[PDB]
Structure formats: structure tokens, C-alpha cells
Amino acid sequence: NEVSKDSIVIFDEAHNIDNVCIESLSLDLTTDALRRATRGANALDERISEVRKVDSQKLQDEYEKLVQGLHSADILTDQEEPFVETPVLPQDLLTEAIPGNIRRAEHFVSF
Amino acid sequence: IKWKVHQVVQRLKDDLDKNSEPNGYMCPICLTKYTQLEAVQLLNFDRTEFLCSLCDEPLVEDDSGKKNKEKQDKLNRLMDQIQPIIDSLKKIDDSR
Amino acid sequence: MFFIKDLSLNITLHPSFFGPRMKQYLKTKLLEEVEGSCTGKFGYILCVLDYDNIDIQRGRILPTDGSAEFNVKYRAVVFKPFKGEVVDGTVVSCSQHGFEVQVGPMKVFVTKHLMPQDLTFNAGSNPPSYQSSEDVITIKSRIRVKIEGCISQVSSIHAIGSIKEDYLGAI
Amino acid sequence: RLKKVEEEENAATLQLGQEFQLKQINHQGEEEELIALNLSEARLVIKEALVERRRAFKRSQKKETREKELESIDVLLEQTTGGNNKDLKNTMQYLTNFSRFRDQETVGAVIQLLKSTGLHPFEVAQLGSLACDTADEAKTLIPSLNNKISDDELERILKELSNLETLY
């Protein structure tokens, strides 16, 4: 973001950089991680149920913002950081709207 | 300890889920409870009340609807009391 | 919802009805103990299909009695009361703790807990009307009810339902 | 045998019951797919069966205007069968009350379209028995349909069905 396009670039002793390249886009799955994901999804689901019970205004606001199709750079400021950081290269990102099948919070949780 | 607290949690959660359901009925002559569906199949011809099969007694409704919030609050405060055990369990799962 | 399938029936015939013309006699018997009937496996049995070329063709005399047993195969229409989707039924009778909706053949009931608590039910109505905007119980009373579950029993069909959903109760 | 619980709900995400599943076998040995039906299609075929059996009795002793039709098939029913079919009276009242097409030809054209589309049978039978012209509202009604079908395809079928069917 804040680099000049016509600077000077040098690299030193990166003769094993292919391994860094490989791990830049490689990932593993374990059982306990799956368990933690299940527990986190359940916690998020119950939190969403509680929030829908107490004040559905924020959820409806988020839902309509997704109906307009805003994104992380659209809504988030600089001082707040994205939770799930962008895993893929920005040249390959999707920039269109969220589908209605996962647009609702409950829909996305079930998804 | 984990099995007992899990059993307590599931027991009280299903107690609250069951207490959120309609209370049901009973015939106090035979001292036998009756579900809402059992009341449905035991109605009168008038389509107003429900008569018992054996005692032929007009069904009187079970009293648990006010108990729903009571069991919810008992669940809440019991979780509050048990919360240090939950935190210690979390730290134990952190440990080996 | 209504279904079509080939279905089998076993029927006894009294030996007094061993006259020379019994095939259409059995067809008649098939008519008034298939049409207008209820079960648990197939629900309310509406009417028969394939009136011609029906499949009986053979029968056994029961050993201890002169009754002759027959096996009948036939296409028909029944009703299958599902659970979990919307029907726009009509209400004929009501109770103090909920209305009894007659969606076609059965009488599905909605408990006073199964109606939404924010529905503005007034007990001083004839019949007791659980209306908020438009779903006033009338002789027509088209109410969008979802069957929570049609509980199956011995051949007397009963169902339960609720209107705690958007456009549920509302058409 | 193992007491074989098999808990199953009936919905439209291909969540179909065992007792009425799709692939059966008919008694002559040929495969028997499930026959699910539309409300207007049932409204047609009850009349078809009634006129067929009535003409069958006409040969026996020889050898679509709903207000007339319900009472006429009623008196045809108590011509031979009994008067106990009050619930069956309720059923064809329901059929003539909420069946999406009063006429046969619109139903026939819709089925002629669907025989080319090759949609899911129970799904499209539920859609046909339903009487609505709003695809997104139907998706809000049934989240099973909301998850299954795209709204664009749902409305692109719904409008070319809605222009044909008799609006109410």
C-alpha cells in the first residue's frame, strides 16, 4: 500500500526462498482445530441468537450493508483491523456482493 | 468431574427446553399426568375441554409455565456458581 | 400432501357371497373400504385409481372358516400430512388456549404457547380470535399454519402446528 | 431388526422420507419412481377418475365450473358410496379453493414444460401446489427453497408459470 512502485529492490541470501513461497500458500488440518472450530461456531451462533434477541438493529444494519455489498475496506477503518486477514493475493480477490444464501448471520453460521 | 458437570449441564438445559414447552395436564383422581397431545385426543364432543379415559375427569392443566423463568434463573445462577470450576477446567485443558 | 402409489390390500369374503357374480362385488367392497379411510402408514386414504384391469385373480379358502381370502393390488390417492412446511388451512372450531385448524381432512391445533406472544389475542371473541393484523378466525379463516409435526398413532390422525414465523398465519 | 430408528424430517433440500422415497419397484418388476402431485393436477385427476368410473357404471347398468362440479361429484358420490366423506368434501373444497389453475390446459402446458426441464419432482410438485407469484417471498417462506434454488432461476420459472395460470 505505502511503497513506491519505482523503488529499488534487492534480495540477499534468499537461495532457499522457495520454501517460504511454499509455506505462503500451504495449510494443515488437525482434529483439535476442528473441535475448536465447532466450539467457536457454536459460541458465535449463541451470541448471534442473544444479539438477535436483545437488539436486532445491528444485525439488520450489517445485513443491509451486505445487501449493498460493502467490503472490509469499505466498512472497516484503519484503526480497526480485519479479523480474518486476507489469505490470498489481492490480484485474485473477489470484489462483488455477498450472496443471499450466506448474507444473513444465521445463514452464514449454518454455512 | 467433567462427565458430571456435562451431565448436569445437559440435564438442566433439557429441563429448561422441556419447561419452555406447554405444561400439559393431569387427572388428579388417578394422579397421572397428561401431555398436551394426550389432552388433544381426550377432548369432549363440545371441543372445549378434555375428559379422562379412566376416571372420566375433566383435565386440569399442569403448572410449569411460570416455572420456566425460575428454572432459567436457577440455571443461570448455577452456571455463575460453577463458573470458577469452568475456568479451572479451561486452564486444565490448556495444561497437560 | 397427496400421494399416488400402487398399494396392496387383503380382504376376507363371507361364503354366503359365493354367487356367480362376485368380481364386481369385490370391486364394490374395495370402494367402500378404501374410499374415506384413514391409517398411519398412508394417512387419509382419499380415492382409488385404475378402476379397470384390477389385480385379484385368485383366492384361498381359509381353513377354519368358509371365508375366502383375497389379495387386492390397486393404484390410489391418499394424503400424507407432513411436518415443517406451510399450509393455508381453514378454521372451524376454536378453544380457549388456541384455534383448531381444519386443513382439509384433519384438524390441526395450535397451542396458546405455539401462537406468538406478540399476537394480541383477545379472549372476548366468538370464536376466540388470535388476530394481530388480518388473521381473524372466521368461517373461511385462511391461516398459514406450519405443521410442527403430524403425530402418527393408530388409525386416528392428529397434528400440531404453530404460527411463530413471518407470513405464518399471514397469507 | 436392531429397532431401526432412522429419524428423518420431510423438506425440500432432497430431505425425503423413506416410507415414500423415490425409487420403488412396481409389482411386475419395473422401477417405480415417486409420484408427487400438484394441487391443480390433483384437481384435474379427481375429475378424470370420477368421470371414468361414472361412465364405467353407465356401461355396468347398460350390460372448471367448480360451483356445479363440487356438488355434482358429491351427488355422484352418494349415488353409490356413503355420506361419511365430509373430510373428502373438505379436500376438494381445498383443491378448488387454492389450486393454482382452474383450467386443464394451463396445467398441461406447465407439465409439458417441466417434462423438458427435468426438475426435482417433489420440489416442483410442492411449488405447483403452492399458489404464489413471488420467488423471493417464497424463498422467505421456505428457507429450504431459499437454500436450494437461486432466486433468479426461481423467478424466471415463476413468471413464465404465473402468466399462464389463472390469477386469484
Side-chain angles (χ1 to χ4, degrees), chain A residues 35-98:
Chain A
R35 215 184 315 114
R36 296 198 47 79
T38 54
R39 291 179 251 113
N42 299 310
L44 278 187
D45 181 59
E46 205 205 357
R47 167 66 167 267
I48 278 176
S49 299
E50 280 301 310
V51 166
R52 194 70 154 195
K53 278 190 175 49
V54 296
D55 182 27
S56 172
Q57 164 57 233
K58 271 271 277 162
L59 298 176
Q60 192 43 68
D61 170 70
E62 178 211 74
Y63 180 70
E64 57 86 22
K65 279 152 96 176
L66 295 172
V67 168
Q68 287 70 241
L70 269 77
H71 305 102
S72 179
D74 293 331
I75 292 169
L76 282 80
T77 75
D78 50 349
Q79 285 197 176
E80 54 193 335
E81 293 208 5
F83 189 44
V84 188
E85 212 162 5
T86 60
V88 300
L89 273 301
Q91 56 210 13
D92 304 329
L93 268 162
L94 275 194
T95 58
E96 56 190 357
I98 308 293

Side-chain angles (χ1 to χ4, degrees), chain C residues 9 11-35 51 54 56 66-70 72, chain D residues 57 60-61 80-81:
Chain C
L9 194 141
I11 178 59
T12 62
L13 174 67
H14 194 278
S16 49
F17 311 116
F18 283 168
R21 81 292 183 276
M22 294 298 103
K23 153 194 152 66
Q24 71 276 17
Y25 182 79
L26 268 296
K27 290 198 273 189
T28 59
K29 289 293 299 218
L30 181 75
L31 282 176
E32 72 294 329
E33 291 83 3
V34 163
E35 265 80 5
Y51 196 107
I54 206 65
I56 61 170
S67 43
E69 182 65 26
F70 274 92
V72 190
Chain D
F57 292 103
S60 88
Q61 292 83 18
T80 46
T81 66

